[PDB]
Design a binder for this molecule. Sequence first.
Ligand SMILES: NS(=O)(=O)c1ccc(-c2cccnc2)cc1
Ligand SMILES: NS(=O)(=O)c1ccc(-c2cccnc2)cc1
Ligand SMILES: [Zn+2]
Length: 257
Amino acid sequence: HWGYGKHNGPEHWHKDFPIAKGERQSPVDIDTHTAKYDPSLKPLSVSYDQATSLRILNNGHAFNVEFDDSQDKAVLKGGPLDGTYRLIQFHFHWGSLDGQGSEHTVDKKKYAAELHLVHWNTKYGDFGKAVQQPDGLAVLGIFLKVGSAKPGLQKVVDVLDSIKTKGKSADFTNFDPRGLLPESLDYWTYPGSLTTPPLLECVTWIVLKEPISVSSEQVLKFRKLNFNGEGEPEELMVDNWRPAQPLKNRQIKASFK
Ligand SMILES: NS(=O)(=O)c1ccc(-c2cccnc2)cc1
Ligand SMILES: NS(=O)(=O)c1ccc(-c2cccnc2)cc1
Ligand SMILES: [Zn+2]
């Protein structure tokens, strides 16, 4: 099916998912000079103290750390958002080389990877219903650069050997996603979409200005994962990012001067 190869990659997606050419597709380039400070934007409220991680899954496109989202345990509020958005999972997109991997770009700069913390609007009752709504999801995007290790990422890195191939999952309890955040919560925000099929136009994107630093060894271990299932020819899970899409009739807003 769809993927990131020459024959099933982002240039092909539109044939099965025509919304790929839509009016609010993600990711986008964040032109820092054109983004406008919006003094009416509230501080983000990230409340992850009660987060309950359950499982980590290689889904053949990335790996998801999944959370119990059957209660308001880990929620995102404030910023551009109206209401309460529940953390369901996080995952990353990354490159084959340190010079690429992020989906969003900043003045055309690509980072080595990008973390997506995916939340759904509780007024829609569940994730499946939320993705059908224009304000159904809030995805918190965080850039990764290669430098010093991120200690809070290590527990994720160390379990990856147990989920090498598509369809593999492993218990992953008591992981605290607060260890993946940068110090500052300054952000850019714009209306967009899922960055993989089904490419639904249901996301309020909140992209943090401050990247986190991860070590070369940490990202190298991401690159040992496989797109393929067990017993299939090895294809390394690398370059699982969609490139920047046209901004069209959208304005990117900044929370900071
Ligand atoms: N991105 S997409 O969803 O439109 C798509 C789906 C499938 C295939 C494909 C490739 C080779 C053999 N069989 C099928 C190519 C593209
Ligand atoms: N990269 S992203 O954060 O925009 C993202 C999040 C979720 C999904 C998704 C949702 C429903 C079904 N299948 C996949 C696709 C992409
Ligand atoms: Zn993503």
